UniProtKB/Swiss-Prot annotation, chains A, B:
The protein, known as: Vimentin
Assembly: Homomer assembled from elementary dimers. Identified in complexes that contain VIM, EZR, AHNAK, BFSP1, BFSP2, ANK2, PLEC, PRX and spectrin. Interacts with BCAS3. Interacts with LGSN. Interacts with SYNM. Interacts (via rod region) with PLEC (via CH 1 domain). Interacts with PLEC isoform 1C. Interacts with STK33. Interacts with LARP6. Interacts with RAB8B. Interacts with TOR1A; the interaction associates TOR1A with the cytoskeleton. Interacts with TOR1AIP1. Interacts with DIAPH1. Interacts with EPPK1; interaction is dependent of higher-order structure of intermediate filament.
Upper classification of the organism: Eukaryota, Metazoa, Chordata, Craniata, Vertebrata
Species in which this protein is naturally found: Homo sapiens (Human)
Transmembrane spans: none
Region of the whole protein represented: 1 to 52 of 466
Renumbered residue ranges of the record's region Disordered: 1-32
Length: 52, 52
């Protein structure tokens, strides 16, 4: 017989389906500004009382 | 007895498929960083009545 040899390409592995590796968890970011506590002159300003 | 059956082994080398040069999946599957900075916008104007 001329041997019908086993043509042995990568039917064994290199597959496949879970090619979904690094899904972007970066879709969860947490951006926030340098959050201000605001200044107020209300404790710099006393009551200048006029005595008559 | 022979035959004319095709005799493909692996026959064109043996090394897998063309086929995965391991393109590096960077860890952008982490969470994008918390940009938690803070502005001390109030104490930087020390608003106190020295009129006492």
């Amino acid at each position: 017989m001329s041997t019908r040899s086993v043509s042995s390409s990568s039917y064994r592995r290199m597959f496949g389906g879970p090619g979904t590796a690094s899904r972007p968890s970066s879709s969860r970011s947490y951006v926030t500004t340098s959050t201000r506590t605001y200044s107020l002159g209300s404790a710099l300003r006393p009551s200048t009382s006029r005595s008559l």
